Design a protein around this motif. Structure first.
Motif, PDB file in Angstrom:
ATOM      1  N   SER A 218       0.787  -1.243   0.000  1.00 47.47           N
ATOM      2  CA  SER A 218       0.000   0.000   0.000  1.00 47.47           C
ATOM      3  C   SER A 218       0.825   1.302   0.000  1.00 47.47           C
ATOM      4  O   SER A 218       0.329   2.354  -0.428  1.00 47.47           O
ATOM      5  N   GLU A 219       2.070   1.223   0.470  1.00 56.98           N
ATOM      6  CA  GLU A 219       2.980   2.366   0.483  1.00 56.98           C
ATOM      7  C   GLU A 219       3.769   2.532  -0.825  1.00 56.98           C
ATOM      8  O   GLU A 219       4.494   3.520  -0.970  1.00 56.98           O
ATOM      9  N   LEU A 220       3.647   1.564  -1.741  1.00 59.62           N
ATOM     10  CA  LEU A 220       4.498   1.449  -2.931  1.00 59.62           C
ATOM     11  C   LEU A 220       3.695   1.518  -4.215  1.00 59.62           C
ATOM     12  O   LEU A 220       4.075   2.231  -5.129  1.00 59.62           O
ATOM     13  N   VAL A 221       2.595   0.765  -4.298  1.00 63.49           N
ATOM     14  CA  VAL A 221       1.765   0.767  -5.498  1.00 63.49           C
ATOM     15  C   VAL A 221       1.240   2.175  -5.775  1.00 63.49           C
ATOM     16  O   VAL A 221       0.811   2.888  -4.867  1.00 63.49           O
ATOM     17  N   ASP A 229       1.242  13.460  -0.656  1.00 64.10           N
ATOM     18  CA  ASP A 229       0.751  12.756   0.533  1.00 64.10           C
ATOM     19  C   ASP A 229       1.645  11.595   0.991  1.00 64.10           C
ATOM     20  O   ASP A 229       1.194  10.675   1.691  1.00 64.10           O
ATOM     21  N   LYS A 230       2.910  11.625   0.615  1.00 68.81           N
ATOM     22  CA  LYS A 230       3.812  10.539   0.946  1.00 68.81           C
ATOM     23  C   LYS A 230       3.901  10.255   2.450  1.00 68.81           C
ATOM     24  O   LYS A 230       3.968   9.096   2.854  1.00 68.81           O
ATOM     25  N   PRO A 235       4.422   6.052   5.448  1.00 63.86           N
ATOM     26  CA  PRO A 235       5.158   6.360   6.680  1.00 63.86           C
ATOM     27  C   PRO A 235       6.253   5.370   7.058  1.00 63.86           C
ATOM     28  O   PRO A 235       7.297   5.804   7.575  1.00 63.86           O
ATOM     29  N   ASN A 236       6.047   4.077   6.794  1.00 63.33           N
ATOM     30  CA  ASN A 236       7.047   3.061   7.164  1.00 63.33           C
ATOM     31  C   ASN A 236       8.255   3.034   6.212  1.00 63.33           C
ATOM     32  O   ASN A 236       9.390   2.854   6.655  1.00 63.33           O
ATOM     33  N   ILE A 241      13.930   4.788   5.145  1.00 59.76           N
ATOM     34  CA  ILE A 241      14.910   5.563   4.384  1.00 59.76           C
ATOM     35  C   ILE A 241      15.633   6.570   5.279  1.00 59.76           C
ATOM     36  O   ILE A 241      16.854   6.704   5.214  1.00 59.76           O
ATOM     37  N   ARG A 242      14.872   7.258   6.114  1.00 58.53           N
ATOM     38  CA  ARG A 242      15.454   8.213   7.044  1.00 58.53           C
ATOM     39  C   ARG A 242      16.482   7.603   7.974  1.00 58.53           C
ATOM     40  O   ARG A 242      17.472   8.270   8.297  1.00 58.53           O
ATOM     41  N   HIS A 243      16.253   6.357   8.401  1.00 52.96           N
ATOM     42  CA  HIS A 243      17.191   5.678   9.266  1.00 52.96           C
ATOM     43  C   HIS A 243      18.482   5.462   8.495  1.00 52.96           C
ATOM     44  O   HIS A 243      19.571   5.752   9.007  1.00 52.96           O
TER      45      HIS A 243
END
Ligand SMILES: O=C(CO)N1CCc2ccccc2C1
Lengths: 462, 169
Positions: A218-221, A229-230, A235-236, A241-243
């Motif tokens: 759901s975060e990729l498709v 609205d990313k 969010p996960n 990536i931030r880590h």
């Protein structure tokens, strides 16, 4: 004999197949002998999603992962209800045609619709969490369903719906946690050189594994991580990536803020040791966060530091860098060849999903009629499927909650913005090893503990 | 055969992908699998000299901000892409150019400014603004339309020309 369904005027899924409503790829579905759908109208895609001749789990998974670009959730539910509600054919003044039609069209199709509902509710419950009326409609549809053939599936769906409305231990012994200079409980002393390099890599591998595993299709498709609205929709992925970015920056910072040459050589050396262990753990995210740091403009230019790096560690770093060369040729082959557990580098997947979605049309036209390009979506579902295959298997390593905390709360940027911070790292690099022809200054030592590494081999047996 | 390692850079929501995809893919097929080697390598004749373009487009990885140096270091020439309907993407160009100069350790890196038109909203960056920025950097400016393929070859061939004018020197 054929079968004699009702007219398309009464039941829209009766329409025969033609070049104007459904088309196929020239090859046949692996394992299963089913034709591979290239494109079709939404009606035809839904017919084949709930097809009478056979089940098609591959098509069902792929469809339910990727449908939202061409069909809203509410529309899907309306369509599968319409599919379910099959009327009978008309005259035969009275049952030859009817008992067959009930048993070989109606009953299979209805079972397939229930199977779709089940997979939808089980694997893509987010549509329902985000639209409560969609769940209302599904519950009143499922309560509507009558047959004794249907009861066991309806019961099962209702159980899954209830489970979804609701708010690790190992195979055998994980290895012993490793300590160097900082002792257990003394979080105030933790740093790059004071923690054991093995345990740094292990505990980062645990963080990065959990981060990799929380990311859902759901975060990729729909390439939603690149749209406005990313933060709402991905969010996960974004935390992951931030880590990774944080740790690359932390490594850079540790390097260039160590102004004394000898101490800086020990720092770079220690980071390469951590890379060695990432490589042993198949944490490729970790590998690349080190490679990115070494390739950063503040670090890469430190020729006086890399001059003193032992040849064995030079080679480790070189090999790791070569994974990234030629569009990740060697990373790709190495990943294919290893067995879980691992932590993939996510960035390749992101680029491939984006380019797949951008480089192929949403629809194909045949004889003036618009067909949904399903093969495009299949390609995207292959990538999300590859991601999921590496999410199943956890690492056999003990969490150390203090070391975990230290790396979770790492914040090398502080209150600074990106530009300000990266200019600071680069100016620091220029200070500690100025450009030719300027001579190399000396700088005082900052570390009051010994610099020698304990190395990268376990201290105790089994 | 000379091979040119080109790198595409720019903000997300911009059409970077479309630019490279439209170069590589045949002029009349709308098919693309980005996994295979032909995705990013293309043989072309520019000013009667056959050559091989290798294009790095990391579109989708913009949040991996600490990997920009790594990716940029791989290139000889750069397309700095912005979208004509996103003012912020235009304003970020100076940062990309600066980071490239730092990574390549050179004041004179082969580079072209590319402004891409896809679909709505409407233009917020007039071509003149971009011509002016390009002129201040001493680099070419090319405007492209993804969907009509206008400008795509010109953008890439102009960057290759820039690399050749840099290497004869
Ligand atoms: O030897 C040096 C600097 O002179 N380096 C610079 C950093 C780096 C990055 C990737 C692969 C290898 C190396 C080794």
């Amino acid at each position: 004999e054929q079968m004699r369904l009702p007219s398309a005027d009464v039941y829209r899924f009766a329409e025969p197949d033609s070049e104007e409503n459904i088309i196929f790829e020239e090859n046949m579905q692996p394992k299963a002998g089913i034709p591979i759908i290239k494109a079709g109208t939404v009606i035809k895609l839904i017919e084949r999603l709930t097809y009478h001749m056979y089940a098609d789990p591959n098509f069902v998974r792929t469809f339910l992962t990727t449908y939202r670009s061409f069909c809203k959730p509410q529309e899907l539910l309306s369509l599968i209800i319409e599919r379910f509600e099959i009327p009978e054919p008309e005259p035969t003044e009275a049952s030859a045609e009817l008992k067959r039609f009930r048993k070989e069209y109606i009953q299979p199709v209805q079972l397939r619709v229930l199977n779709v509902c089940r997979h939808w509710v089980e694997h893509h419950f987010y549509d329902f969490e985000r639209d409560a009326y969609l769940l209302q409609r599904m519950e009143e549809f499922i309560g509507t369903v009558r047959g004794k053939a249907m009861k066991k599936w309806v019961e099962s769906i209702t159980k899954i719906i209830q489970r979804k409305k609701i708010a690790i231990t190992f195979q055998s012994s994980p290895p012993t946690v490793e300590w160097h200079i900082s002792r257990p409980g003394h979080i105030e002393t933790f740093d790059l050189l004071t923690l054991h390099p093995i345990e740094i890599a292990r505990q980062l591998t645990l963080l990065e594994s959990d981060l990799y595993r929380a990311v859902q299709p759901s975060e990729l498709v729909g390439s939603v991580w690149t749209k406005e609205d990313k933060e709402i929709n991905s969010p996960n992925l974004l935390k992951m990536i931030r880590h990774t970015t944080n740790l690359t920056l932390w490594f850079e910072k540790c390097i260039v803020e160590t102004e004394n040459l000898e101490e800086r050589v020990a720092v770079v050396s220690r980071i390469i040791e951590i890379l060695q262990v990432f490589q042993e753990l198949n944490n490729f995210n970790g590998v690349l966060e080190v490679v990115s740091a070494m390739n950063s403009s503040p670090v890469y230019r430190l020729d006086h530091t890399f001059e003193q790096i032992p040849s064995r560690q030079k080679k480790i770093l070189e090999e790791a860098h070569e994974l990234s060369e030629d569009h990740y040729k060697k990373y790709l082959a190495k990943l294919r060849s290893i067995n879980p557990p691992c932590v993939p580098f996510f960035g390749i997947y992101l680029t491939n999903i984006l380019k797949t979605e951008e480089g192929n049309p949403e629809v194909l036209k045949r004889h003036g009629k618009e067909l949904i390009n399903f093969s495009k979506r299949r390609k995207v579902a292959e990538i999300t499927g590859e991601i999921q295959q590496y999410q199943n298997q956890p690492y056999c390593l003990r969490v150390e909650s203090d070391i975990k905390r230290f790396f979770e709360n790492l914040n090398p940027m502080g209150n600074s913005m990106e530009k300000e911070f990266t200019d600071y790292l680069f100016n620091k690099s220029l200070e500690i090893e100025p450009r030719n022809p300027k001579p190399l200054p000396r700088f005082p030592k900052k570390y009051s503990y010994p610099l020698k590494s304990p190395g990268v081999r376990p201290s105790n047996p089994r | 055969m000379t091979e040119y390692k080109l790198v595409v850079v720019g903000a997300c929501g911009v059409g970077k992908s479309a630019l490279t995809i439209q170069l590589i893919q045949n002029h009349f097929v709308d098919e693309y699998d980005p996994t295979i080697e032909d995705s990013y390598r293309k043989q072309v004749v520019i000013d009667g000299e056959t050559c091989l373009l290798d294009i790095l487009d990391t579109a989708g990885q913009e949040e991996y901000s600490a990997m920009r140096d790594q990716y940029m270091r791989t290139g000889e020439g750069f397309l700095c892409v912005f979208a004509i309907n996103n003012t912020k993407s235009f304003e970020d160009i100076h940062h990309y150019r600066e980071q490239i100069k730092r990574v390549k350790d050179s004041e004179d890196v082969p580079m072209v400014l590319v402004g891409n038109k896809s679909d709505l909203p409407s233009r917020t960056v007039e071509s003149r603004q971009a011509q002016d920025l390009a002129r201040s950097y001493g680099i070419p400016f090319i405007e492209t339309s993804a969907k009509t393929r206008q400008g795509v070859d010109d953008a890439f061939y102009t960057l290759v020309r820039e690399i050749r004018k840099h290497k004869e020197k």
